[PDB]
Design a protein around this ligand. Structure first.
Ligand SMILES: NC(=O)c1ccc[n+]([C@@H]2O[C@H](COP(=O)([O-])OP(=O)(O)OC[C@H]3O[C@@H](n4cnc5c(N)ncnc54)[C@H](OP(=O)(O)O)[C@@H]3O)[C@@H](O)[C@H]2O)c1
Ligand SMILES: [Mg+2]
Length: 282
């Protein structure tokens, strides 16, 4: 169904735009035409939330969204993210000096052809690992805060953050969404999802099917089979019923998968099936 993200209601089945680019989200996509077709069909299918970034393929993913969908329905929310830059070797690097965050915000503005960004995710990176790690984010957020006052950005969100960081952030500005790694097999954020929900802040999982062990994978497959669904559909449907503040942004460069992902809304998970799925992580 729906969720109010900032001041705009969004269909909880949205679209991640990260597959509309070359391998490693770098360079142009396989086929620009199919990318355009996928975006247009998504809208036609009821998508009104698109997740993107200007460091996808540097810039080209945003330009495709523009070529395909400008001028945008005013029902449409485009969410983008800043905080990283791309090496010319496809590498992802820290990019959170005021100059870089300001340039990133304007890059988005130009490539999407917008006058203001709906939602900007600040994407955190601490330590030498990849995921959530402790450290103050005040400096970056203050910069995003100022561009909000200037009217370049309506709403601020967070990406790849620990519960403490969210807590530090929410004293500097309003946070409308948190975007973290989370799926059936990786449920460390469970507590935060419920707490966010109670404050009306959305939570946005990525890797819906990522990093499953064979046993984890075969269980999901078993469940799909018995339901006449695909594993992807089961994964999305589980996310949908897990909490009402959860927004899905599955990415795909294929129209068939798009329609299939969107069909996941029709799938209804019995208690016995949820029992099996909740045990995948345990
Ligand atoms: N903020 C961050 O730190 C960050 C990091 C990662 C992702 N994200 C966002 O989150 C979104 C989701 O990305 P993700 O990393 O969670 O992974 P994902 O986009 O859900 O997975 C992408 C892969 O799944 C395949 N796929 C999609 N639907 C399928 C289906 N129905 N059947 C079989 N395969 C299917 C795609 O292949 P096909 O193209 O051939 O269908 C593609 O190879 C992204 O679009 C991006 O915007 C953000
Ligand atoms: Mg993706």
């Amino acid at each position: 169904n729906t969720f109010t993200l900032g001041t705009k209601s969004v269909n909880r089945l949205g679209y991640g735009a990260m597959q509309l680019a070359g391998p490693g989200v770098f360079g142009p996509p396989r086929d620009r035409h199919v990318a355009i077709t996928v975006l247009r069909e998504a809208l036609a299918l009821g998508v009104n939330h698109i997740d993107t970034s200007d460091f996808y393929g540097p810039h080209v993913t945003n330009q495709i969204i523009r070529e395909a969908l400008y001028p945008y329905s005013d029902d449409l929310t485009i969410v983008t993210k800043i905080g990283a830059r791309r090496g010319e070797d496809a590498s992802w690097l820290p990019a959170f000096s005021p100059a870089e965050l300001q340039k990133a915000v304007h890059d988005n503005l130009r490539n999407l052809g917008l006058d203001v960004l709906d939602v900007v995710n600040l994407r955190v990176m601490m330590g030498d690992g990849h995921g959530p790690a402790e450290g103050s984010i005040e400096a970056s957020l203050t910069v995003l805060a100022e561009m909000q006052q200037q009217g370049l950005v309506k709403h601020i969100g967070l990406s790849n953050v620990t519960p403490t960081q969210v807590a530090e952030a929410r004293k500097i500005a309003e946070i409308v969404c948190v975007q973290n790694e989370y799926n059936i097999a990786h449920r460390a954020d469970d507590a935060m999802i419920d707490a966010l929900a109670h404050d009306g802040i959305a939570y946005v999982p990525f890797f819906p099917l990522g990093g499953f062990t064979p046993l984890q994978s075969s269980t999901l497959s078993d469940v799909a089979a018995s339901l006449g669904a695909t594993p992807m559909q089961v994964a999305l449907a589980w996310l949908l019923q897990r909490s009402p503040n959860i927004l899905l942004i599955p990415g795909t460069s294929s129209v068939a998968h798009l329609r299939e992902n969107m069909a996941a809304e029709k799938l209804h998970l019995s208690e016995e099936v949820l029992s099996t799925l909740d045990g995948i992580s345990r």
